[PDB]
C-alpha cells in the first residue's frame, strides 16, 4: 500500500537512523524528550497516529467521534488487535495507562498532559486530592474507550497522538511493575519490538509480527544510533554507515552538503522553539530586571543568520506564531528597537542590579552535549559580554542528555538551553507549558494572570476567541521575561536516496519506521 506500484523494493529492508542520544527510558510515563518518543513510537501505538506528512490517521482506534460541546470523545478500538505477547488490546489498557500517567506514584514528567486535555479529575489526581480510578475515562466495553473533559477541547484528537498517551499492557505492567520496560519483559502494540539495546551504542528493532497492520509494514529491522554531535552524524552518513541523520547538521558544512548530496538534504519547517530557559526561582534570575537585561542584549539574528544559517527564524515569544490559533501572538516592542538602544537599556538594568566589569553577572549555560548547541552557547556568551561592555561573564556546562534533563527538572541550573517541539498542532501545546502547575514547567515560571489568560480560552466558543486568549497569555509571559526565546526551528537532515517515505513536510518531524521503505535502484 505505502509502496508505489511497480517500485523495486530492496530485499533486506534494514535501516540505520541516528536517534541523537541515549534515551532516559523506554517507558512513555517516565520520559519527556524526542529520543525517548522516537523509541516509544516504534514499540507502542495510541488511539491516533500520523503519516509521513504529519496528517492524522487511525491507530489503535479505527473510528472516533465527539459530542457537539467538544467534551465527550469516544474511541472505537480494533476488535482483533493484539499485544506482541498475544494478549488483546482493549479499552482497559487505555484506562490503565492514562490512570498510571496522572498517578502521583508514577511521578511522570508528562503527568500534566491529561490536565491539558481537561479530563475530569486529572488535575485533582495529579494534586493527590482524588484516587487515579476517579479519572474521567472509561471502558464502556472492551473495545470502546470514552474520554470525559470538563471544558471544550476541539483539538482533542491531535493530543492523543503524543507518547504520554500510548497504551501500556495492563496485564504485564500490573505483574512486573516498572521492570516491564526491560528488553526481556517489554510488550507493545506497535509495528516493532526491541531486539537489542547497548547503552550509549545502539537500539535494534525487529518487526512485531502481531502488530494489527504488520501486513503493510515494510522495514524488517532498524538500528537507532546515539551520536551526540552533528559532525559525527554526517561523517557516519558519508562513510555509508547510517541512512538518516538526526535533525542537526554542522552549519559550516551545510552549503557544501547541499551541493554534493543532490536531493539528500531535507529541511523540515517544524513547530518548535529554541530558548534559553531562566531559572525563575534561583537568584539572581528571580529578578525581572536581570531577565529583561538578558533578553534585550541577545541578538537573535546573529545566531540564526551567522552561527546556524539553515533557515531558523528569530523569535522573541515562546509559541511559534504560525501554529494553528497562534496568529494573534505579537512579537514584543523591544524586538523592533536597534541593538544600540537595547544594549544601552540592558547595561543600565545590570548596573542598577549592582554589576560592573570588575563584578560581572556570572552564570553557566547548561546544555546537552552537542557541538551545535556549544556553538550557539559560545555565541550567546560572547554577545552577552560584548553587548553589555563586560557586565556579564558566561561559562558553558555540557551534560549528557539524561543528566541534562535531570538537572533541568531538579532546578540545578541558572540558564539552560531548551527546545520545545509541538506535541500537537495547536497553540496550547506551547501555552500550556508555562501554566504555574505544569509538570513540563522547568523554568519555575508562575503568574496567576498567565494561568487566568490561558483559562479564558475554554470559555471561548471559536478559534478567534481562543487565539485572543493565547495572545494575552504570551503578552504576560513576555512582560515577565520568563525565558529568552531565540528561534523557531527547522530540522535539517541527510536522508539516503534509497530511503523512501520521509517527506520533509511533517511539522513535528516524526520518523515512524512503519512509514519507510528501501528501494533497489
Amino acid at each position: 500500500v505505502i509502496v508505489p506500484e511497480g517500485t523495486q523494493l530492496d530485499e533486506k529492508q534494514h535501516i540505520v537512523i541516528n536517534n541523537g542520544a541515549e534515551p532516559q527510558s523506554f517507558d512513555p510515563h517516565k520520559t519527556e524528550g524526542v529520543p525517548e518518543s522516537n523509541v516509544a513510537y516504534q514499540l507502542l501505538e495510541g488511539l491516533v497516529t500520523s503519516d509521513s506528512e504529519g496528517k492524522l490517521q487511525p491507530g489503535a482506534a479505527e473510528s472516533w467521534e465527539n459530542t457537539p460541546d467538544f467534551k465527550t470523545w469516544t474511541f472505537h478500538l480494533r476488535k482483533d488487535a493484539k499485544w506482541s505477547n498475544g494478549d488483546p488490546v482493549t479499552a482497559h489498557d487505555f484506562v490503565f495507562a492514562w490512570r498510571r500517567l496522572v498517578d502521583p506514584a508514577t511521578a511522570a514528567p508528562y503527568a500534566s498532559y491529561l490536565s491539558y486535555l481537561q479530563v475530569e479529575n486529572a488535575q485533582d489526581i495529579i494534586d493527590g486530592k482524588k484516587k487515579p480510578a476517579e479519572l474521567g475515562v472509561e471502558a464502556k466495553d472492551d473495545y470502546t474507550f470514552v474520554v470525559h473533559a470538563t471544558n471544550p477541547v476541539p483539538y482533542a484528537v491531535s493530543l492523543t497522538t503524543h507518547q504520554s498517551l500510548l497504551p501500556l499492557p495492563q496485564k504485564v505492567v500490573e505483574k512486573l511493575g516498572d521492570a516491564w520496560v526491560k528488553k526481556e519483559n517489554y510488550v507493545g502494540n506497535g509495528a516493532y519490538k526491541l531486539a537489542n539495546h547497548i547503552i550509549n551504542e545502539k537500539i535494534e528493532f525487529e518487526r512485531n509480527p502481531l502488530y494489527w497492520n504488520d501486513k503493510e509494514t515494510v522495514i524488517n529491522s532498524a538500528t537507532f544510533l546515539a551520536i551526540e554531535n552533528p559532525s559525527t552524524d554526517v561523517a557516519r552518513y558519508r562513510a555509508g554507515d547510517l541512512d538518516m541523520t538526526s535533525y542537526g547538521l554542522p552549519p559550516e558544512q551545510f552549503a557544501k552538503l547541499k551541493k554534493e548530496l543532490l536531493g539528500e538534504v531535507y529541511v523540515t519547517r517544524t513547530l518548535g522553539t529554541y530558548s534559553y530557559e531562566l531559572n525563575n526561582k534561583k537568584a539572581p534570575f528571580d529578578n525581572v530586571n536581570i531577565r529583561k537585561a538578558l533578553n534585550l542584549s541577545l541578538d537573535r539574528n546573529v545566531i540564526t543568520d551567522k552561527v546556524l544559517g539553515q533557515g531558523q527564524t528569530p523569535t522573541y515569544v515562546f509559541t511559534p506564531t504560525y501554529i494553528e490559533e497562534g496568529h494573534l501572538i505579537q512579537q514584543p516592542a523591544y524586538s523592533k528597537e536597534p541593538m544600540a538602544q537595547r544594549n544601552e537599556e540592558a547595561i543600565k538594568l545590570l548596573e542598577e542590579a549592582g554589576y560592573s566589569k570588575a563584578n560581572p553577572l556570572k552564570f553557566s549555560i547548561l546544555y546537552n552535549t552537542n557541538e551545535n548547541h556549544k556553538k550557539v552557547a559560545i555565541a550567546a556568551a560572547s554577545m552577552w559580554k560584548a553587548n553589555t561592555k563586560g557586565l556579564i561573564d558566561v561559562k558553558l556546562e555540557n551534560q549528557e542528555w539524561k543528566t541534562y534533563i535531570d538537572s533541568r527538572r531538579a532546578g540545578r541550573y541558572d540558564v539552560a538551553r531548551a527546545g520545545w517541539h509541538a506535541d500537537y498542532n495547536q497553540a496550547t501545546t506551547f501555552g500550556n507549558y508555562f501554566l504555574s502547575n505544569s509538570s513540563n514547567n522547568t523554568a519555575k515560571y508562575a503568574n496567576p494572570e498567565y494561568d487566568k489568560a490561558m483559562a479564558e480560552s475554554y470559555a471561548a466558543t471559536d478559534a478567534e476567541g481562543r487565539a485572543k486568549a493565547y495572545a494575552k497569555a504570551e503578552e504576560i509571559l513576555g512582560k515577565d521575561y520568563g525565558i529568552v526565546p531565540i528561534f523557531n526551528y527547522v530540522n535539517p537532515r541527510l536522508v539516503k536516496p534509497y530511503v523512501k517515505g520521509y517527506s520533509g513536510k511533517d511539522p513535528q518531524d516524526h520518523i515512524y519506521l512503519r512509514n519507510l521503505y528501501i528501494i533497489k535502484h
Binding site: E32, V34, Q163, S246, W401, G419, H421, D423
Partner: peptide
C-alpha cells in the same frame, strides 16, 4: 516534547 523536549528537543535533543
Amino acid at each position: 516534547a523536549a528537543a535533543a
